[PDB]
Structure formats: structure tokens, C-alpha cells
mmCIF file of N, CA, C and O in Angstrom:
data_model
loop_
_atom_site.group_PDB
_atom_site.id
_atom_site.type_symbol
_atom_site.label_atom_id
_atom_site.label_comp_id
_atom_site.label_asym_id
_atom_site.label_seq_id
_atom_site.Cartn_x
_atom_site.Cartn_y
_atom_site.Cartn_z
ATOM 1 N N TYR A 1259 126.245 134.117 67.312
ATOM 2 C CA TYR A 1259 126.625 134.760 68.545
ATOM 3 C C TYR A 1259 127.812 134.049 69.147
ATOM 4 O O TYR A 1259 128.389 134.506 70.141
ATOM 5 N N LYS A 1260 128.210 132.935 68.553
ATOM 6 C CA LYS A 1260 129.336 132.236 69.095
ATOM 7 C C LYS A 1260 130.532 133.065 68.712
ATOM 8 O O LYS A 1260 130.780 133.333 67.538
ATOM 9 N N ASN A 1261 131.274 133.465 69.726
ATOM 10 C CA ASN A 1261 132.416 134.354 69.621
ATOM 11 C C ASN A 1261 132.020 135.740 69.108
ATOM 12 O O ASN A 1261 132.826 136.439 68.491
ATOM 13 N N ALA A 1262 130.799 136.181 69.410
ATOM 14 C CA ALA A 1262 130.408 137.524 69.035
ATOM 15 C C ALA A 1262 130.692 138.473 70.169
ATOM 16 O O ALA A 1262 130.440 138.142 71.326
ATOM 17 N N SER A 1263 131.153 139.659 69.835
ATOM 18 C CA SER A 1263 131.355 140.711 70.814
ATOM 19 C C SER A 1263 130.036 141.194 71.383
ATOM 20 O O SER A 1263 129.036 141.277 70.670
ATOM 21 N N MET A 1264 130.025 141.494 72.677
ATOM 22 C CA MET A 1264 128.853 142.068 73.330
ATOM 23 C C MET A 1264 129.252 143.176 74.270
ATOM 24 O O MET A 1264 130.312 143.115 74.911
ATOM 25 N N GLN A 1265 128.368 144.157 74.408
ATOM 26 C CA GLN A 1265 128.597 145.247 75.342
ATOM 27 C C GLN A 1265 127.690 145.012 76.511
ATOM 28 O O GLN A 1265 126.670 144.348 76.362
ATOM 29 N N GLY A 1266 127.991 145.561 77.664
ATOM 30 C CA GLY A 1266 127.046 145.379 78.752
ATOM 31 C C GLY A 1266 127.503 145.988 80.040
ATOM 32 O O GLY A 1266 128.627 146.480 80.151
ATOM 33 N N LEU A 1267 126.606 145.955 81.007
ATOM 34 C CA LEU A 1267 126.804 146.533 82.312
ATOM 35 C C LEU A 1267 126.117 145.808 83.424
ATOM 36 O O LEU A 1267 125.113 145.113 83.241
ATOM 37 N N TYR A 1268 126.657 145.982 84.603
ATOM 38 C CA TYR A 1268 126.008 145.452 85.758
ATOM 39 C C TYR A 1268 125.288 146.576 86.461
ATOM 40 O O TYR A 1268 125.880 147.622 86.748
ATOM 41 N N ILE A 1269 124.036 146.353 86.800
ATOM 42 C CA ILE A 1269 123.314 147.334 87.596
ATOM 43 C C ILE A 1269 123.124 146.775 88.981
ATOM 44 O O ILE A 1269 122.591 145.682 89.184
ATOM 45 N N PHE A 1270 123.575 147.527 89.947
ATOM 46 C CA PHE A 1270 123.537 147.054 91.303
ATOM 47 C C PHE A 1270 122.361 147.667 92.014
ATOM 48 O O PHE A 1270 121.961 148.775 91.723
ATOM 49 N N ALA A 1271 121.911 147.010 93.097
ATOM 50 C CA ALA A 1271 120.724 147.450 93.863
ATOM 51 C C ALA A 1271 120.813 148.896 94.312
ATOM 52 O O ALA A 1271 119.799 149.594 94.418
ATOM 53 N N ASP A 1272 122.003 149.337 94.621
ATOM 54 C CA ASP A 1272 122.214 150.726 94.920
ATOM 55 C C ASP A 1272 122.223 151.201 93.496
ATOM 56 O O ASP A 1272 123.082 150.757 92.751
ATOM 57 N N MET A 1273 121.237 151.962 93.030
ATOM 58 C CA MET A 1273 121.207 152.198 91.590
ATOM 59 C C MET A 1273 122.431 152.890 91.103
ATOM 60 O O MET A 1273 122.528 154.115 91.048
ATOM 61 N N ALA A 1274 123.336 152.044 90.693
ATOM 62 C CA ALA A 1274 124.663 152.365 90.260
ATOM 63 C C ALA A 1274 125.072 151.319 89.290
ATOM 64 O O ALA A 1274 124.522 150.217 89.299
ATOM 65 N N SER A 1275 126.039 151.620 88.461
ATOM 66 C CA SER A 1275 126.469 150.600 87.555
ATOM 67 C C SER A 1275 127.931 150.645 87.251
ATOM 68 O O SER A 1275 128.615 151.656 87.427
ATOM 69 N N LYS A 1276 128.409 149.506 86.798
ATOM 70 C CA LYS A 1276 129.770 149.351 86.335
ATOM 71 C C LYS A 1276 129.741 148.559 85.058
ATOM 72 O O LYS A 1276 128.998 147.583 84.953
ATOM 73 N N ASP A 1277 130.516 148.975 84.075
ATOM 74 C CA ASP A 1277 130.517 148.260 82.812
ATOM 75 C C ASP A 1277 131.111 146.891 82.952
ATOM 76 O O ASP A 1277 131.986 146.672 83.790
ATOM 77 N N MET A 1278 130.663 145.982 82.104
ATOM 78 C CA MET A 1278 131.266 144.672 82.042
ATOM 79 C C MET A 1278 132.516 144.803 81.211
ATOM 80 O O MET A 1278 132.533 145.543 80.225
ATOM 81 N N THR A 1279 133.554 144.084 81.572
ATOM 82 C CA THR A 1279 134.742 144.072 80.752
ATOM 83 C C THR A 1279 134.421 143.059 79.672
ATOM 84 O O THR A 1279 133.528 142.240 79.887
ATOM 85 N N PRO A 1280 135.106 143.005 78.525
ATOM 86 C CA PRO A 1280 134.839 141.994 77.523
ATOM 87 C C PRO A 1280 135.096 140.590 78.055
ATOM 88 O O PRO A 1280 134.433 139.632 77.667
ATOM 89 N N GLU A 1281 135.974 140.455 79.040
ATOM 90 C CA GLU A 1281 136.191 139.143 79.603
ATOM 91 C C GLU A 1281 134.899 138.638 80.234
ATOM 92 O O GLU A 1281 134.614 137.443 80.230
ATOM 93 N N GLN A 1282 134.118 139.565 80.789
ATOM 94 C CA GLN A 1282 132.886 139.230 81.449
ATOM 95 C C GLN A 1282 131.761 139.134 80.448
ATOM 96 O O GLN A 1282 131.002 138.165 80.456
ATOM 97 N N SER A 1283 131.700 140.039 79.472
ATOM 98 C CA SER A 1283 130.560 139.928 78.580
ATOM 99 C C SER A 1283 130.660 138.627 77.802
ATOM 100 O O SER A 1283 129.639 138.036 77.444
ATOM 101 N N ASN A 1284 131.875 138.121 77.611
ATOM 102 C CA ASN A 1284 132.075 136.883 76.911
ATOM 103 C C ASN A 1284 131.603 135.675 77.703
ATOM 104 O O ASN A 1284 131.233 134.664 77.110
ATOM 105 N N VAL A 1285 131.659 135.716 79.043
ATOM 106 C CA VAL A 1285 131.257 134.516 79.742
ATOM 107 C C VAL A 1285 129.765 134.457 79.760
ATOM 108 O O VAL A 1285 129.175 133.388 79.605
ATOM 109 N N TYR A 1286 129.139 135.618 79.856
ATOM 110 C CA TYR A 1286 127.704 135.589 79.941
ATOM 111 C C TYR A 1286 127.190 135.217 78.584
ATOM 112 O O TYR A 1286 126.188 134.532 78.458
ATOM 113 N N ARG A 1287 127.902 135.618 77.543
ATOM 114 C CA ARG A 1287 127.512 135.279 76.210
ATOM 115 C C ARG A 1287 127.535 133.774 76.025
ATOM 116 O O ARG A 1287 126.524 133.142 75.701
ATOM 117 N N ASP A 1288 128.617 133.131 76.427
ATOM 118 C CA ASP A 1288 128.727 131.701 76.203
ATOM 119 C C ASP A 1288 127.632 130.956 76.939
ATOM 120 O O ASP A 1288 127.172 129.900 76.496
ATOM 121 N N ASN A 1289 127.238 131.491 78.083
ATOM 122 C CA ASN A 1289 126.197 130.893 78.887
ATOM 123 C C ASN A 1289 124.806 131.550 78.728
ATOM 124 O O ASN A 1289 123.891 131.200 79.477
ATOM 125 N N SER A 1290 124.639 132.516 77.803
ATOM 126 C CA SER A 1290 123.343 133.183 77.640
ATOM 127 C C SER A 1290 122.813 133.167 76.218
ATOM 128 O O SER A 1290 121.619 133.424 76.024
ATOM 129 N N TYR A 1291 123.670 132.871 75.226
ATOM 130 C CA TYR A 1291 123.203 132.876 73.855
ATOM 131 C C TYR A 1291 122.197 131.765 73.891
ATOM 132 O O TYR A 1291 121.971 131.191 74.944
ATOM 133 N N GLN A 1292 121.516 131.501 72.816
ATOM 134 C CA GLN A 1292 120.370 130.586 72.835
ATOM 135 C C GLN A 1292 119.144 131.374 73.277
ATOM 136 O O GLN A 1292 118.063 131.178 72.738
ATOM 137 N N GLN A 1293 119.292 132.273 74.250
ATOM 138 C CA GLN A 1293 118.192 133.091 74.713
ATOM 139 C C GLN A 1293 118.153 134.421 73.970
ATOM 140 O O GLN A 1293 117.270 135.241 74.184
ATOM 141 N N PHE A 1294 119.132 134.658 73.118
ATOM 142 C CA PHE A 1294 119.230 135.927 72.417
ATOM 143 C C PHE A 1294 118.267 135.976 71.273
ATOM 144 O O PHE A 1294 118.025 134.970 70.612
ATOM 145 N N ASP A 1295 117.771 137.157 70.994
ATOM 146 C CA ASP A 1295 116.897 137.339 69.861
ATOM 147 C C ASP A 1295 117.634 137.243 68.559
ATOM 148 O O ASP A 1295 118.778 137.673 68.439
ATOM 149 N N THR A 1296 116.981 136.646 67.589
ATOM 150 C CA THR A 1296 117.463 136.553 66.219
ATOM 151 C C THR A 1296 116.373 136.983 65.285
ATOM 152 O O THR A 1296 115.236 137.229 65.695
ATOM 153 N N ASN A 1297 116.703 137.115 64.038
ATOM 154 C CA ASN A 1297 115.709 137.577 63.117
ATOM 155 C C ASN A 1297 114.516 136.649 63.053
ATOM 156 O O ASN A 1297 114.649 135.428 63.068
ATOM 157 N N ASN A 1298 113.344 137.272 63.007
ATOM 158 C CA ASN A 1298 112.022 136.661 62.899
ATOM 159 C C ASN A 1298 111.555 135.878 64.126
ATOM 160 O O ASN A 1298 110.509 135.230 64.084
ATOM 161 N N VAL A 1299 112.288 135.955 65.225
ATOM 162 C CA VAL A 1299 111.874 135.324 66.475
ATOM 163 C C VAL A 1299 112.043 136.253 67.657
ATOM 164 O O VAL A 1299 112.764 137.243 67.582
ATOM 165 N N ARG A 1300 111.394 135.923 68.753
ATOM 166 C CA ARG A 1300 111.587 136.653 69.992
ATOM 167 C C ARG A 1300 111.792 135.656 71.101
ATOM 168 O O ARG A 1300 111.022 134.714 71.228
ATOM 169 N N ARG A 1301 112.776 135.869 71.944
ATOM 170 C CA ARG A 1301 113.038 134.905 72.995
ATOM 171 C C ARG A 1301 112.944 135.470 74.380
ATOM 172 O O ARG A 1301 113.130 136.669 74.626
ATOM 173 N N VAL A 1302 112.655 134.569 75.287
ATOM 174 C CA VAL A 1302 112.539 134.894 76.675
ATOM 175 C C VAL A 1302 113.818 134.643 77.423
ATOM 176 O O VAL A 1302 114.293 133.515 77.505
ATOM 177 N N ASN A 1303 114.352 135.696 78.011
ATOM 178 C CA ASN A 1303 115.586 135.602 78.760
ATOM 179 C C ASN A 1303 115.176 134.996 80.068
ATOM 180 O O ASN A 1303 114.096 135.339 80.555
ATOM 181 N N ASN A 1304 115.984 134.125 80.636
ATOM 182 C CA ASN A 1304 115.656 133.591 81.937
ATOM 183 C C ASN A 1304 116.660 134.086 82.955
ATOM 184 O O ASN A 1304 117.535 134.871 82.603
ATOM 185 N N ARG A 1305 116.518 133.668 84.206
ATOM 186 C CA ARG A 1305 117.414 134.073 85.274
ATOM 187 C C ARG A 1305 118.795 133.482 85.081
ATOM 188 O O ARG A 1305 118.936 132.323 84.702
ATOM 189 N N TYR A 1306 119.825 134.278 85.304
ATOM 190 C CA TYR A 1306 121.174 133.781 85.165
ATOM 191 C C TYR A 1306 121.742 133.294 86.483
ATOM 192 O O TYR A 1306 121.621 133.978 87.501
ATOM 193 N N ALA A 1307 122.381 132.135 86.477
ATOM 194 C CA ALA A 1307 122.948 131.610 87.704
ATOM 195 C C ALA A 1307 124.268 130.929 87.457
ATOM 196 O O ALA A 1307 124.535 130.446 86.361
ATOM 197 N N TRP B 1598 136.485 174.321 122.317
ATOM 198 C CA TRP B 1598 136.606 174.963 123.627
ATOM 199 C C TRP B 1598 137.802 174.518 124.432
ATOM 200 O O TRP B 1598 138.295 175.253 125.282
ATOM 201 N N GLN B 1599 138.292 173.345 124.173
ATOM 202 C CA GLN B 1599 139.518 172.929 124.802
ATOM 203 C C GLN B 1599 140.344 172.507 123.639
ATOM 204 O O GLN B 1599 140.635 173.325 122.778
ATOM 205 N N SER B 1600 140.614 171.229 123.513
ATOM 206 C CA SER B 1600 141.286 170.753 122.328
ATOM 207 C C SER B 1600 140.231 170.053 121.508
ATOM 208 O O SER B 1600 140.508 169.418 120.499
ATOM 209 N N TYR B 1601 139.012 170.132 122.001
ATOM 210 C CA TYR B 1601 137.882 169.477 121.400
ATOM 211 C C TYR B 1601 137.176 170.362 120.408
ATOM 212 O O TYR B 1601 136.935 171.538 120.689
ATOM 213 N N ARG B 1602 136.774 169.782 119.274
ATOM 214 C CA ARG B 1602 136.018 170.486 118.234
ATOM 215 C C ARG B 1602 134.790 169.697 117.794
ATOM 216 O O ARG B 1602 134.905 168.540 117.399
ATOM 217 N N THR B 1603 133.626 170.334 117.810
ATOM 218 C CA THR B 1603 132.380 169.678 117.400
ATOM 219 C C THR B 1603 131.808 170.241 116.128
ATOM 220 O O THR B 1603 131.591 171.445 116.021
ATOM 221 N N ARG B 1604 131.506 169.373 115.173
ATOM 222 C CA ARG B 1604 130.943 169.845 113.913
ATOM 223 C C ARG B 1604 129.525 170.342 114.108
ATOM 224 O O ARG B 1604 128.691 169.636 114.680
ATOM 225 N N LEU B 1605 129.244 171.546 113.621
ATOM 226 C CA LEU B 1605 127.921 172.132 113.791
ATOM 227 C C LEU B 1605 126.981 172.079 112.593
ATOM 228 O O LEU B 1605 125.786 172.320 112.757
ATOM 229 N N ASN B 1606 127.464 171.707 111.420
ATOM 230 C CA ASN B 1606 126.608 171.682 110.247
ATOM 231 C C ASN B 1606 126.989 170.586 109.298
ATOM 232 O O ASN B 1606 128.072 170.025 109.405
ATOM 233 N N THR B 1607 126.140 170.309 108.322
ATOM 234 C CA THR B 1607 126.544 169.342 107.320
ATOM 235 C C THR B 1607 126.455 169.989 105.982
ATOM 236 O O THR B 1607 125.610 170.843 105.752
ATOM 237 N N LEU B 1608 127.349 169.625 105.097
ATOM 238 C CA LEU B 1608 127.348 170.225 103.789
ATOM 239 C C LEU B 1608 126.810 169.336 102.682
ATOM 240 O O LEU B 1608 126.864 169.723 101.518
ATOM 241 N N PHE B 1609 126.308 168.142 102.997
ATOM 242 C CA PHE B 1609 125.883 167.278 101.896
ATOM 243 C C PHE B 1609 124.430 166.862 101.918
ATOM 244 O O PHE B 1609 124.041 165.898 101.261
ATOM 245 N N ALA B 1610 123.569 167.627 102.553
ATOM 246 C CA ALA B 1610 122.172 167.206 102.638
ATOM 247 C C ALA B 1610 121.547 166.977 101.271
ATOM 248 O O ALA B 1610 120.684 166.112 101.122
ATOM 249 N N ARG B 1611 121.978 167.713 100.262
ATOM 250 C CA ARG B 1611 121.407 167.549 98.943
ATOM 251 C C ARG B 1611 121.695 166.177 98.388
ATOM 252 O O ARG B 1611 120.914 165.664 97.576
ATOM 253 N N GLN B 1612 122.855 165.612 98.719
ATOM 254 C CA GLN B 1612 123.174 164.323 98.167
ATOM 255 C C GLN B 1612 122.260 163.314 98.800
ATOM 256 O O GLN B 1612 121.627 162.515 98.118
ATOM 257 N N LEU B 1613 122.008 163.469 100.084
ATOM 258 C CA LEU B 1613 121.167 162.493 100.742
ATOM 259 C C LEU B 1613 119.784 162.489 100.159
ATOM 260 O O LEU B 1613 119.155 161.434 100.077
ATOM 261 N N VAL B 1614 119.309 163.655 99.758
ATOM 262 C CA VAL B 1614 117.996 163.726 99.158
ATOM 263 C C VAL B 1614 118.028 163.029 97.813
ATOM 264 O O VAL B 1614 117.128 162.238 97.496
ATOM 265 N N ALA B 1615 119.062 163.311 97.022
ATOM 266 C CA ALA B 1615 119.192 162.731 95.705
ATOM 267 C C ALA B 1615 119.262 161.231 95.775
ATOM 268 O O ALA B 1615 118.786 160.544 94.877
ATOM 269 N N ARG B 1616 119.875 160.720 96.827
ATOM 270 C CA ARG B 1616 119.987 159.293 96.966
ATOM 271 C C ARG B 1616 118.671 158.694 97.444
ATOM 272 O O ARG B 1616 118.206 157.710 96.897
ATOM 273 N N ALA B 1617 117.959 159.316 98.372
ATOM 274 C CA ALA B 1617 116.714 158.680 98.799
ATOM 275 C C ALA B 1617 115.763 158.574 97.653
ATOM 276 O O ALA B 1617 115.026 157.596 97.530
ATOM 277 N N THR B 1618 115.837 159.539 96.776
ATOM 278 C CA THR B 1618 114.979 159.633 95.644
ATOM 279 C C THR B 1618 115.032 158.396 94.770
ATOM 280 O O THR B 1618 114.031 158.082 94.125
ATOM 281 N N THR B 1619 116.173 157.708 94.689
ATOM 282 C CA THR B 1619 116.283 156.579 93.797
ATOM 283 C C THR B 1619 116.073 155.222 94.472
ATOM 284 O O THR B 1619 116.209 154.183 93.816
ATOM 285 N N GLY B 1620 115.733 155.201 95.767
ATOM 286 C CA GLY B 1620 115.459 153.931 96.441
ATOM 287 C C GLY B 1620 116.043 153.756 97.836
ATOM 288 O O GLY B 1620 117.119 154.253 98.176
ATOM 289 N N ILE B 1621 115.391 152.908 98.614
ATOM 290 C CA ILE B 1621 115.814 152.665 99.973
ATOM 291 C C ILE B 1621 117.186 152.045 100.058
ATOM 292 O O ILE B 1621 117.933 152.325 100.990
ATOM 293 N N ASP B 1622 117.531 151.237 99.086
ATOM 294 C CA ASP B 1622 118.810 150.593 99.103
ATOM 295 C C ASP B 1622 119.949 151.533 98.863
ATOM 296 O O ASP B 1622 121.073 151.228 99.253
ATOM 297 N N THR B 1623 119.723 152.678 98.215
ATOM 298 C CA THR B 1623 120.875 153.523 98.061
ATOM 299 C C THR B 1623 120.998 154.365 99.301
ATOM 300 O O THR B 1623 122.092 154.545 99.830
ATOM 301 N N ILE B 1624 119.874 154.777 99.884
ATOM 302 C CA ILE B 1624 120.002 155.628 101.050
ATOM 303 C C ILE B 1624 120.564 154.865 102.229
ATOM 304 O O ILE B 1624 121.214 155.457 103.068
ATOM 305 N N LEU B 1625 120.309 153.565 102.318
ATOM 306 C CA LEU B 1625 120.790 152.763 103.437
ATOM 307 C C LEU B 1625 122.053 151.986 103.108
ATOM 308 O O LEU B 1625 122.392 151.020 103.804
ATOM 309 N N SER B 1626 122.722 152.367 102.033
ATOM 310 C CA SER B 1626 123.939 151.705 101.623
ATOM 311 C C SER B 1626 125.069 152.074 102.553
ATOM 312 O O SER B 1626 124.973 153.013 103.354
ATOM 313 N N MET B 1627 126.166 151.337 102.458
ATOM 314 C CA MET B 1627 127.338 151.690 103.224
ATOM 315 C C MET B 1627 127.980 152.933 102.655
ATOM 316 O O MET B 1627 128.542 153.741 103.384
ATOM 317 N N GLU B 1628 127.921 153.084 101.346
ATOM 318 C CA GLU B 1628 128.534 154.205 100.669
ATOM 319 C C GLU B 1628 127.940 155.515 101.105
ATOM 320 O O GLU B 1628 128.651 156.489 101.304
ATOM 321 N N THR B 1629 126.659 155.509 101.393
ATOM 322 C CA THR B 1629 125.961 156.709 101.812
ATOM 323 C C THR B 1629 126.574 157.243 103.073
ATOM 324 O O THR B 1629 126.753 158.447 103.242
ATOM 325 N N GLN B 1630 126.966 156.349 103.945
ATOM 326 C CA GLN B 1630 127.459 156.692 105.255
ATOM 327 C C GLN B 1630 128.902 157.108 105.212
ATOM 328 O O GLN B 1630 129.486 157.407 106.251
ATOM 329 N N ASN B 1631 129.465 157.112 104.009
ATOM 330 C CA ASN B 1631 130.801 157.534 103.737
ATOM 331 C C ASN B 1631 130.825 158.822 102.926
ATOM 332 O O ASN B 1631 131.845 159.180 102.331
ATOM 333 N N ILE B 1632 129.724 159.565 102.904
ATOM 334 C CA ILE B 1632 129.842 160.844 102.235
ATOM 335 C C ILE B 1632 130.734 161.656 103.148
ATOM 336 O O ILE B 1632 130.501 161.746 104.349
ATOM 337 N N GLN B 1633 131.784 162.238 102.613
ATOM 338 C CA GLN B 1633 132.678 162.936 103.502
ATOM 339 C C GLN B 1633 132.381 164.402 103.734
ATOM 340 O O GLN B 1633 131.924 165.116 102.843
ATOM 341 N N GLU B 1634 132.709 164.836 104.940
ATOM 342 C CA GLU B 1634 132.631 166.202 105.398
ATOM 343 C C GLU B 1634 134.063 166.692 105.556
ATOM 344 O O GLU B 1634 134.944 165.881 105.812
ATOM 345 N N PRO B 1635 134.360 167.966 105.351
ATOM 346 C CA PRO B 1635 135.684 168.540 105.479
ATOM 347 C C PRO B 1635 136.177 168.601 106.907
ATOM 348 O O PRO B 1635 135.397 168.901 107.817
ATOM 349 N N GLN B 1636 137.497 168.496 107.086
ATOM 350 C CA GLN B 1636 138.068 168.599 108.418
ATOM 351 C C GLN B 1636 137.665 169.933 108.999
ATOM 352 O O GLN B 1636 137.634 170.956 108.310
ATOM 353 N N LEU B 1637 137.407 169.940 110.294
ATOM 354 C CA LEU B 1637 136.920 171.140 110.940
ATOM 355 C C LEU B 1637 137.892 172.288 111.028
ATOM 356 O O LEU B 1637 137.485 173.440 111.012
ATOM 357 N N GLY B 1638 139.165 172.018 111.115
ATOM 358 C CA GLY B 1638 140.094 173.117 111.283
ATOM 359 C C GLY B 1638 141.494 172.652 111.134
ATOM 360 O O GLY B 1638 141.727 171.487 110.835
ATOM 361 N N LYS B 1639 142.444 173.542 111.365
ATOM 362 C CA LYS B 1639 143.833 173.168 111.222
ATOM 363 C C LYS B 1639 144.066 171.934 112.053
ATOM 364 O O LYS B 1639 143.699 171.908 113.234
ATOM 365 N N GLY B 1640 144.654 170.928 111.436
ATOM 366 C CA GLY B 1640 144.931 169.670 112.080
ATOM 367 C C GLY B 1640 145.175 168.618 111.023
ATOM 368 O O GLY B 1640 145.279 168.932 109.828
ATOM 369 N N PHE B 1641 145.257 167.383 111.463
ATOM 370 C CA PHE B 1641 145.533 166.249 110.601
ATOM 371 C C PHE B 1641 144.889 165.000 111.147
ATOM 372 O O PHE B 1641 144.464 164.961 112.293
ATOM 373 N N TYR B 1642 144.798 163.974 110.334
ATOM 374 C CA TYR B 1642 144.242 162.726 110.809
ATOM 375 C C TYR B 1642 145.359 161.747 111.043
ATOM 376 O O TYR B 1642 146.395 161.818 110.376
ATOM 377 N N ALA B 1643 145.180 160.850 111.993
ATOM 378 C CA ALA B 1643 146.197 159.835 112.215
ATOM 379 C C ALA B 1643 145.587 158.526 112.666
ATOM 380 O O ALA B 1643 144.517 158.460 113.274
ATOM 381 N N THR B 1644 146.269 157.448 112.335
ATOM 382 C CA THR B 1644 145.766 156.132 112.686
ATOM 383 C C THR B 1644 146.538 155.526 113.806
ATOM 384 O O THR B 1644 147.761 155.413 113.761
ATOM 385 N N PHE B 1645 145.803 155.109 114.816
ATOM 386 C CA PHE B 1645 146.390 154.512 115.993
ATOM 387 C C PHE B 1645 145.980 153.073 116.157
ATOM 388 O O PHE B 1645 144.810 152.756 116.390
ATOM 389 N N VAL B 1646 146.937 152.173 116.061
ATOM 390 C CA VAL B 1646 146.573 150.786 116.207
ATOM 391 C C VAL B 1646 147.063 150.330 117.557
ATOM 392 O O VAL B 1646 148.269 150.307 117.832
#
């Protein structure tokens, strides 16, 4: 997942959304991988801060 | 009746229903309060600072 492309979106409390730009999906990736699922395992995502 | 004009109806009640349907936060959002209504009659808007 290091330097892997990811797609994604932000969902806001007003149930509405805006897509993440790749610049953004990349930062969350660098700070969220490790929690990502891989083959033969399941992982628990935690709160992002 | 003079140069004064009062709006007598609203044209977006359906949107308000659609928004309440998805949660309190969308109905009480700032955006909700910006659903626009058409100008009442011949005229224009202007900003006075």
C-alpha cells in the first residue's frame, strides 16, 4: 500500500459528500495503511486524527 | 401596494421534506436556509454598504 493509489470520499454530517482528491487520499493512506486489510487477515480501522 | 412587495408562497417545500428525511443536521444546516426563491417581480437586487 506504500505509494498505492486509493479512491475515496468525505461524508459530511449534512448527508452530503465530496470526493477526495488524490492529494488527499494519499495523505490518509500514508497515515492509515497498517490498518488496511490484506489477504488472510482482517483489521480494525481506528479513529483518524 | 406601494413600492412594497410581500411574498405569499413558497416553491420549495418538497426540498425541505427531502432534507428532513435524512437527518436533523441537514434540515438545520446553513445551506437549507439558502434554498432560493425567485424574485417577486420586475426589479433587481443591489448591495448597499
